[PDB]
């Protein structure tokens, strides 16, 4: 019973740990895909059927 | 429970708590007996002026290197921003 | 109890799990207060968390730092090794 | 920048934005834990 | 409407067991010496 | 001139000065949809005031492009013209606070 | 005090000997003073001579705003901006105004910890006699011994 | 005779429920500092001052606001040809003459 | 539940109606009806629209009146 | 496709890298096309390198 | 009748370590507390805005009556405030 | 008042205000193709962009739901009507990446790629300046 | 467990025990048609599945998802400047919604964000701090991080002092390359 | 206790994939700053066809 019980134990937290492993790292990732930048040109891009149209500022 | 009213009694384990008298435990005895195998009472203690003696002199002393000690905490806490640790450089 | 085999709290802590139906109810209330708590203030604090000159620096960090420090790796690795970008064609 | 044959190009190929290296190197790194999570379940499949 | 509060510098001689830092007071002479002192003065502060 | 001019004025000075960034008032989100609405209210209050040759109007129509696709403000600016546009209608004519 | 007045638009530059801690805030109060120069708040128009100050009382000080970038140099090499300069001179300042600070410190922490010893030991003492008396057994119709 | 939910449970949970609500919202008003103090209005700085304006009598009253403005759209147009607010007062007056 | 006991104190029997005779009053009827049939459904059936209506109606001191007063940059007369 | 180019050499520089795309055929209709050709391109293409050695020699100047 | 309040150092966070302040393209150190004027000001957004709209409300008045220094006031000693919590990582 | 309508001190002296060019980039058909074009991948119409520059792309879909998608760019965002959607990018190395619409689109939902050509910073102002 | 009926089970007081849980359970059962049979359906039910060690790992993880799934939902409506359920806001253009701007801002910023983002060195290889620089405010400047984010990251060295590219990899190193050959100004 | 081999199977077999990984960082690194394989000023549009 005691061995049996550590393995189901096991069974159950092995996993969460991965999981607790994934979760900062997938944090990270997130907040740099969503982070404010200075960009400084700006593309507009649309798509129709079938076709994409793109909107670029032009030279003064 | 009856907490904050006129029927306030003592929850369960406040009772629970007063019945462990712990009668005929002794768990800090050693401490005792270990300090008595430094004879302090049989050499100054017992007698009056031994014990006056003691105070003195070990105030003396006590109050010596307790400034020692406090002196070398705050040399470290302060390290690299007390006069003597920044030798001062002259302008050319 | 967290990351806790429940064997352990039954046999260690008898009284505290006489009852088991309340006992799995505090499982899930204590795991219930963990996981809303993390959002509310670990997630959610606003404009903190953004003292970089205050980086841990733990134990091994400073360890291993020292090593290197002692030596030359150190300075060999914090030096730019390359700052052109074409080499010279002779 | 285009598909090449008979690529395998586990995980992505040929990043030219700092995203885009971060998206490889993410299936990187969780890739050995997935070979592990694999054999070390694969390997009590037996009598 | 009293003055603004002044804000809560961490300065280091304010912990119980810290210190004036005379790096920063040597510093700070030198510009009560060049910037302060033409209009103000300090009476009660001597050489010594 | 001030460091921190762009915030004081407005919050709108930001983006007007810094035309392909983020506004403070929708950065927290990926879509801009409700950002290019606000600038093209922001255009259509200021013709009202100033007229359609000011420069002021004619820079709140670029900033007004910098967020908004073409297909979209080509309709907008249709509506506007007739008189039928909902973000440019007088205030005295709005029906919003009618039978509720 | 005439001649400085007089020289400064009738206002009279106060002695710095005791400022870091003749004021609400303290040492704290020179640093902000010295950095929270600002534009002046729309409506408010200040003549010459005059400044905007958030943290003066009124908001117009009489004083120009001393600390400018690369005023002095250092002979340490730190870099001089207006801000180092500030937290310099008011350390500078707090120290002018009590130049026992330290002495009176380390004593104290000498004093401090030696009193928590002497807490220990009087309280000690006063749990031994009293034990005498809180724990007595007084009866009328019963003996228990 | 034997209960499953809370003896009142209806008016618990309800009740209950809304009063977290309202007291959580506060919360976060607080910590993030949120202006908590109620404007009906349209917050357009120039209309606004227009308003004054015919509350005070230098504008005549009953004018429309596309009668204010320095663009025009085209159904704007159409009403300013048919526009007579001197007209429109003089009927308000008679109207309040036959009422007293 | 918990077995409790019927909590009505008030009179059991008003006696045979003889023409409205050696009957109690009029609103000491309405509250022994009360007692006799439960004052939880009196409360809980017009809580809900208590509530609502003190909410909104409050308004008229809150919102209303006191807006009128809260505005500081409203008492502010302009060229004055 | 530079740094799949530039990681090939790395990996061919330390250890055995073998790559299907060096030995098999990319497409199916391989076996048939051992003599095929499109004439029309080849003229072609070799005019547009004609062309781009005299631009090349003009732009050195 | 001193200067500050003591506090333990546990409660006063003094910078752990030491950024040096930026150079400008000239070569002058640009002062940190500027670089940290924009950044503060937005987190005292809210009280910008209303500052903003005082500004706003005091340049309709026809008559030359109007400040708005409270407002001021307040966004002044917010963006303070964060300025305090971050500036001396930056000095020496 | 004028100061609501915040704008530049240049343009209030005259400066001109910039104005915006749209075009549009289709597939190149298959009896179109050159002897070295790309089959399913060339247009007719590349995007060209700037190198080791930060660029906003905003993303929407004018009738039904398409997706720009150009791998080597570590980007995929769904063009979906109503959704102005901002992605940022940084390129790193000048080259032309391919890509193809990521969302059923209609028939030819195939037949929509996505070409982006980055090219130094110098040669990009040329090209906008003549195109 | 006890096996025997005689012996009575222990129960705490409140809405979540051995005592509540049996008032209840036989509520809508036709198998419990008396008391000794209901009290041994009863204990064989509490026996089988409060009783099982492993059962109380899933009661852990229902209470912490739960949890995170209930404050999320409340973060949204209390503080998501893009969430209306109060309607002033909604009655006016959008250039005129102060009172929902105000949360703009602070909801940009939240503690994690700050805390996490300067660990992308341990992700780019390349310029992983090619974006930490922005002049406007509205967030704060990033510093990256001193050391690999705790876990798998066995590829790259765990501080990067210890690195030996990592310095010359830095977008500072890269613009200072691109500068001398007048490439571009990043 | 068999299962403990296939943690160390599991083990040994994902550690060869994080050497590569190594490796591959190790590469990248060196892309832009040393590889001719990296090149600036190359790219010209083609332009409209
Ligand atoms: C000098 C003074 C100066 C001024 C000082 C001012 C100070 C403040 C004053 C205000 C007061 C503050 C009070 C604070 C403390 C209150 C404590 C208290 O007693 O509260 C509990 C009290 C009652 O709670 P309780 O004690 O649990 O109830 C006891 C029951 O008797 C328990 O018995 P029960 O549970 O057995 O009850 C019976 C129950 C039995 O039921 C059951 O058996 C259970 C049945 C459940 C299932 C039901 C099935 C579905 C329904 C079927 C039938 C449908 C019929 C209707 C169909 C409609 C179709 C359209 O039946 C029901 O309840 C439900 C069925 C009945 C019909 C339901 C109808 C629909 C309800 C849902 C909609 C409600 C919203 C409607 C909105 C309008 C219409 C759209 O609740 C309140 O008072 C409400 C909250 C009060 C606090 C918040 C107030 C906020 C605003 C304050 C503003 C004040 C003015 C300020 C001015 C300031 C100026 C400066
Ligand atoms: C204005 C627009 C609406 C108009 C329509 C309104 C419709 C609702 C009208 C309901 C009337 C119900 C009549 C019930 C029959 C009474 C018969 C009779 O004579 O009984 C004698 C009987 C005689 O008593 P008894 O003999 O039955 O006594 C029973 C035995 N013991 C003594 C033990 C109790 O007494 C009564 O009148 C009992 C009934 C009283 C019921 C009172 C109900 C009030 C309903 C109105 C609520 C108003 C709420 C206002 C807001 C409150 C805010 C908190
Ligand atoms: C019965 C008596 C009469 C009662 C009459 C009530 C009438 C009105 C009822 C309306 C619906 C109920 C909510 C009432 C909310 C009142 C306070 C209020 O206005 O809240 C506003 C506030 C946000 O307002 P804004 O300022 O516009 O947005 C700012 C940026 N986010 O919204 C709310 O808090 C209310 C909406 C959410 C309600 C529910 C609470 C949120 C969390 C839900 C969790 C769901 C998952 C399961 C939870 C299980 C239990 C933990
Ligand atoms: C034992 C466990 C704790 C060990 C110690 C952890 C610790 O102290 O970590 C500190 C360390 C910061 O240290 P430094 O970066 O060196 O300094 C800060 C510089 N600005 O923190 C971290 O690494 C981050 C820890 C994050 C924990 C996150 C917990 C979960 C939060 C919510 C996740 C998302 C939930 C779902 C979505 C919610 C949306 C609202
Ligand atoms: C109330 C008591 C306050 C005591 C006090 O000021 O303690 C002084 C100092 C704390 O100053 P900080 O600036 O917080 O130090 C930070 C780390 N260098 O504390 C100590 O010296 C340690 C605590 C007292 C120990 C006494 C031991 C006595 C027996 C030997
Ligand atoms: C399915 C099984 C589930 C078992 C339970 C899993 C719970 C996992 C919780 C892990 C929390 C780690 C991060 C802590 C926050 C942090 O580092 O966060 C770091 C930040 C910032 O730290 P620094 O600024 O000092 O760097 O901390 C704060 O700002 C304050 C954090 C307060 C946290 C309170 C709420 C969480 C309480 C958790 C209690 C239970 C912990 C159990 C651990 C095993
Ligand atoms: C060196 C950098 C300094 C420091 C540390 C101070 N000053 Fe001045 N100061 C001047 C005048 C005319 C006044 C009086 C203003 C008025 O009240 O009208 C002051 C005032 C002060 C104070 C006190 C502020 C108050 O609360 O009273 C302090 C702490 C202070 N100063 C410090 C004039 C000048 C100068 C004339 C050009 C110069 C230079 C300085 N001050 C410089 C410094
Ligand atoms: Cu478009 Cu698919
Ligand atoms: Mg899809």
Redesign the interface.
Same mark, same amino acid.
């Given at each position: 019973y005691?061995l049996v019980?550590?393995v189901e134990?096991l069974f159950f !937290?092995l996993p969460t740990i991965i999981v607790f492993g994934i979760c900062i790292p997938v944090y990270t990732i997130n907040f740099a895909q969503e982070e404010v930048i200075y960009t400084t040109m700006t593309v507009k891009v649309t798509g129709r059927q079938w076709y994409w149209v793109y909107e670029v500022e032009s030279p003064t | 429970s009856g907490f904050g009213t006129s029927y306030a009694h003592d929850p369960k384990w406040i009772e629970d708590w007063m019945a462990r008298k712990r009668v005929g435990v002794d768990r800090m005895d050693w401490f005792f007996r270990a300090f008595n195998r430094l004879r302090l009472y049989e050499l100054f203690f017992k007698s009056t002026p031994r014990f006056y003696a003691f105070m003195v002199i070990g105030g003396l002393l006590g109050s010596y290197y307790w400034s020692r000690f406090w002196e070398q905490y705050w040399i470290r806490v302060n390290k690299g921003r007390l006069y003597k640790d920044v030798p001062y450089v002259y302008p050319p | 109890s967290?990351?806790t085999?429940?064997?352990w709290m039954?046999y260690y802590f008898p009284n505290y799990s006489?009852?088991?139906?309340?006992?799995?109810?505090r499982?899930?209330? =204590?795991?219930?207060? =963990?996981? #809303?708590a993390? $959002?509310?203030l670990?997630?959610?604090? +606003?404009?903190?968390?953004?003292?970089?000159?205050?980086?841990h620096?733990s134990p091994?960090?400073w360890y291993?730092?020292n090593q290197?420090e002692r030596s030359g790796q150190?300075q060999?690795?914090?030096? =730019?090794?390359?700052?052109? #970008?074409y080499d010279e064609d002779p | 920048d285009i598909p090449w044959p008979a690529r395998t190009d586990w995980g992505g190929h040929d990043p030219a934005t700092p995203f885009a290296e971060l998206m490889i190197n993410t299936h990187s790194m969780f890739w050995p834990v997935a070979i592990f999570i694999y054999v070390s379940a694969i390997y009590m499949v037996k009598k | 409407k009293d003055p603004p509060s002044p804000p809560d510098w961490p300065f280091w001689f304010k912990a119980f067991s810290h210190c004036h830092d005379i790096p920063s007071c040597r510093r700070g002479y030198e510009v009560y010496r060049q910037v302060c002192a033409t209009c103000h003065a300090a009476r009660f502060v001597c050489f010594r | 001139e001030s460091a921190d001019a762009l915030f004081v004025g407005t919050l709108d000075r930001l983006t007007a000065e810094h035309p392909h960034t983020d506004d403070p008032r929708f950065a927290f989100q990926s879509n801009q949809w409700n950002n290019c609405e606000l600038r093209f209210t922001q255009f259509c209050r200021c013709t009202r005031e100033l007229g359609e040759d000011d420069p002021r109007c004619k820079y709140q129509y670029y900033r007004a492009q910098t967020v908004c696709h073409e297909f979209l403000l080509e309709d907008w600016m249709e509506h506007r013209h007739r008189g039928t546009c909902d973000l440019d209608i007088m205030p005295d004519r709005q029906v919003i606070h009618m039978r509720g | 005090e005439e001649a400085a007045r007089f020289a400064n638009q009738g206002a009279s530059p106060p002695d710095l000997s005791q400022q870091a801690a003749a004021h609400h805030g303290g040492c704290d109060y020179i640093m902000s003073l010295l950095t929270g120069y600002r534009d002046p708040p729309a409506g408010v128009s200040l003549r010459s001579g005059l400044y905007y100050n958030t943290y003066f009382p009124g908001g117009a000080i009489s004083m120009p705003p001393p600390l400018n970038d690369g005023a002095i140099e250092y002979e340490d090499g730190t870099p001089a901006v207006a801000s180092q300069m500030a937290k310099d001179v008011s350390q500078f300042l707090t120290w002018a105004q009590d130049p026992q600070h330290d002495e009176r410190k380390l004593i104290g922490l000498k004093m401090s910890t030696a009193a928590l010893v002497w807490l220990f030991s009087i309280s000690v003492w006063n749990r031994h006699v009293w034990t005498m008396i809180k724990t007595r057994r007084i009866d009328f119709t019963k003996t228990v011994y | 005779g034997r209960r499953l939910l809370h003896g009142n449970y209806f008016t618990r949970y309800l009740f209950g429920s809304l009063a977290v609500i309202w007291i959580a919202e506060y919360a976060a008003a607080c910590?993030?500092g949120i202006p908590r103090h109620r404007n009906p209005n349209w917050m357009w700085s120039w209309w606004l001052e227009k308003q004054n304006q015919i509350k005070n009598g230098e504008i005549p009253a009953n004018t429309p606001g596309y009668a204010m403005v320095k663009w025009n759209n085209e159904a704007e147009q159409r009403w300013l040809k048919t526009l007579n607010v001197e007209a429109m007062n003089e009927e308000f007056a008679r109207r309040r003459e036959a009422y007293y | 539940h918990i077995p409790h006991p019927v909590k009505y104190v008030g009179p059991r029997r008003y006696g045979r109606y003889v023409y409205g005779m050696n009957r109690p009053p009029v609103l000491r009827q309405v509250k022994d009806w009360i007692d006799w049939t439960g004052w939880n459904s009196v409360f809980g059936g017009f809580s809900f629209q208590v509530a609502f209506g003190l909410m909104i109606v409050s308004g008229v001191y809150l919102n209303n009146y006191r807006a009128t007063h809260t505005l500081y940059y409203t008492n502010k007369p302009d060229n004055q | 496709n530079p740094i799949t180019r530039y990681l090939d050499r790395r990996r061919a520089e330390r250890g055995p890298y073998y790559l299907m795309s060096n030995v098999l055929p990319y497409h199916p209709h391989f076996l048939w096309m051992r003599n095929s050709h499109d004439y029309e391109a080849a003229e072609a293409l070799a005019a547009r390198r004609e062309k781009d050695r005299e631009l090349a020699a003009k732009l050195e100047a | 009748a001193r200067a500050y309040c003591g506090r333990f150092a546990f409660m006063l966070d003094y910078?752990?370590?030491?950024?040096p302040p930026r150079k400008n393209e000239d070569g002058d150190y640009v002062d940190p507390r500027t670089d940290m004027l924009p950044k503060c000001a937005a987190?005292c957004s809210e009280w910008l805005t209303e500052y903003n709209a005082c500004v706003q409300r005091i340049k309709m008045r026809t008559d030359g009556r109007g400040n708005c220094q409270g407002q001021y006031e307040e966004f002044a000693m917010c963006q303070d405030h964060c300025i305090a919590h &971050?500036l001396f990582?930056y000095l020496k | 008042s004028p100061e609501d309508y915040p704008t530049p001190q240049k343009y209030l002296e005259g400066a001109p205000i910039p104005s915006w060019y749209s075009f549009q980039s289709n597939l190149v058909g298959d009896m179109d193709l050159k002897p070295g074009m790309a089959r399913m991948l060339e247009v007719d119409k590349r995007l060209t962009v700037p190198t080791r520059t930060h660029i906003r792309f905003l993303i929407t879909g004018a009738d039904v739901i398409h997706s720009w998608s150009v791998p080597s760019l570590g980007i995929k965002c769904d063009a979906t009507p109503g959704r102005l959607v901002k992605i940022n990018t940084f390129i790193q190395r000048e080259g032309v990446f391919y890509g193809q619409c990521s969302e059923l689109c209609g028939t030819l939902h195939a037949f929509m790629p996505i070409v982006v050509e980055a090219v130094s910073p110098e040669a990009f102002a040329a090209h906008a300046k003549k195109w | 467990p006890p096996t025997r009926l005689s012996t009575p089970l222990?129960?705490?007081g409140?809405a979540? %025990?051995?005592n509540?849980?049996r008032n209840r359970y036989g509520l809508y059962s036709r198998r419990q048609t008396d008391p000794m049979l209901a009290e041994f359906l009863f204990r064989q039910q509490?026996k089988e599945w409060?009783?099982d060690?492993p059962?109380?790992?899933y009661? *852990?993880?229902?209470?912490?998802?739960?949890?995170?799934?209930?404050? $999320?939902i409340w973060?949204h409506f209390l #503080?998501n400047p893009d969430v209306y359920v109060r309607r002033q806001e909604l009655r006016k253009m959008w250039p005129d919604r102060h009172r929902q701007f105000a949360y703009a801002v +602070?909801?940009l910023? +939240?503690?994690?964000?700050?805390?996490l983002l300067?660990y992308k060195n341990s992700f780019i290889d390349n310029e992983p701090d090619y974006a930490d620089y922005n002049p406007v405010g509205l967030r704060?400047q990033?510093?990256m *991080? =001193?050391?690999r984010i705790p876990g798998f990251f066995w590829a790259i060295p765990?501080?990067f #002092?210890?690195?030996?590219? !990592? %310095?010359?990899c830095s977008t500072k190193?890269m613009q %200072?390359?691109?500068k001398?050959?007048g490439y571009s100004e990043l | 206790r068999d299962w403990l081999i296939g943690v160390m199977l599991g083990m040994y077999l994902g550690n060869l994939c994080v050497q590569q990984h190594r490796q591959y960082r190790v590469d990248m690194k060196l892309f832009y700053? &040393?590889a001719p394989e990296h090149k600036?000023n190359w790219v010209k549009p083609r332009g409209d066809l």
């Open positions: 005691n019980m550590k134990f !937290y | - | 967290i990351f085999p429940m064997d039954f006489r009852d088991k139906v309340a006992l799995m109810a499982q899930i209330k =204590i795991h219930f207060a =963990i996981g #809303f993390l $959002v509310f670990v997630y959610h604090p +606003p404009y903190k968390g953004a003292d970089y000159g205050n980086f620096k091994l960090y291993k730092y290197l150190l060999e690795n914090l030096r =730019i090794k390359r700052d052109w #970008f | - | - | - | - | 910590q993030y | - | - | 910078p752990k370590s030491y950024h987190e &971050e990582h | - | 222990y129960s705490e409140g979540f %025990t051995v509540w849980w509490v409060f009783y060690v059962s109380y790992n009661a *852990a993880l229902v209470g912490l998802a739960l949890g995170i799934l209930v404050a $999320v973060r #503080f +602070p909801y910023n +939240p503690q994690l964000k700050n805390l300067p704060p990033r510093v *991080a =001193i050391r765990q501080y #002092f210890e690195d030996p590219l !990592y %310095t010359s190193n %200072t390359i691109y001398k050959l | 700053l &040393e600036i």
